[PDB]
UniProtKB/Swiss-Prot annotation:
It holds the Pfam family Ribosomal_L5. The lineage of its organism: Bacteria, Bacillati, Actinomycetota, Actinomycetes, Mycobacteriales. It comes from Mycolicibacterium smegmatis (strain ATCC 700084 / mc(2)155) (Mycobacterium smegmatis). The keyword Transferase does not apply. One of its GO terms (biological process) is translation. This is Large ribosomal subunit protein uL5.
Length: 182
RNA sequence: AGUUUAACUGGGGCGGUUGCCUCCUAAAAUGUAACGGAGGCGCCCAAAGGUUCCCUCAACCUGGACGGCAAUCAGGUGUUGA
């Protein structure tokens, strides 16, 4: 009875546009976004685990889902890290949660991006993938700026079903992220 | 005053060893020496035990920023090279 505007968009207009613009043999060659990944590894828990709790608090308030933290999958003396210390916080999505969060992000954080300049095609990998790292956490609405103690990191990435980068870029710009003009 | 004050030893003495475990020497059953070649043990564990269940890496291209050659990542060749 309730469902996200991007879900509808995908069903009716994005799918039709991509089909027309690439002449797929079948309807569903249309790649579809698979997983929005939201993790973080500070690397500072090796000296103090207090900041990890705050980062997870930010992740929970941003998502409402309870992020996990992983240990030192290997151990490195140079990084002063031993296996078993928690360094990486994760929080994942799927489906309606994926696209509600994506709509909120596109509507709020992107126009809210200080000195926003658009994102380039070239950080793809040719297989329809898209991932990079957030300047600052404070960009988000539900988070409180008066309570942020130290500027820490967040990431909410997107992925595709695209076989190559061509379809990935086509559908992604159809969704309408701010690609550069070069 | 009665006694003790090791053996191995390529002469003795000084060095080193003295039991146990792994490999090679070992001639494709076992076994098989040398002061031959090389390494460890005199523990750890209420779970690192039992069982049931889930699942499997690392190699890999990219980076909304720190964050770098490497921190967490997901897309999608991935057969122990972890
Ligand atoms: Mg894809
Ligand atoms: Mg006598
Ligand atoms: Mg003798
Ligand atoms: Mg002699
Ligand atoms: Mg001698
Ligand atoms: Mg034999
Ligand atoms: Mg003999
Ligand atoms: Mg020894
Ligand atoms: Mg058990
Ligand atoms: Mg992935």
């Amino acid at each position: 009875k309730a469902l996200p505007r991007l879900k509808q968009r995908y069903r009716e207009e994005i799918r039709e546009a991509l089909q027309q613009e690439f002449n797929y043999a079948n309807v569903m060659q249309i790649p579809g976004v698979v997983k929005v990944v939201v993790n973080m590894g500070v690397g500072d828990a090796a000296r103090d685990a207090k900041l990890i709790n705050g980062a997870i608090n930010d992740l929970a308030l941003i998502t409402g889902q309870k992020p996990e933290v992983r240990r030192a999958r290997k151990s490195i003396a140079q990084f002063k890290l031993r296996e078993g210390m928690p360094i990486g916080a994760r929080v994942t999505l799927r489906g309606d949660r994926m696209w509600e969060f994506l709509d909120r992000l596109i509507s709020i954080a992107l126009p809210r991006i200080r000195d926003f300049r658009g994102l380039s095609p070239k950080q793809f990998d040719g297989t329809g993938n898209y991932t990079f790292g957030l300047n600052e956490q404070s960009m988000f609405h539900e988070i409180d700026v008066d309570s942020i103690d130290r500027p820490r990191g967040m990431d909410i990435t997107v992925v595709t079903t695209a076989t190559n980068d061509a379809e990935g870029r086509a559908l992604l710009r159809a969704l309408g992220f701010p690609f550069k003009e070069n």
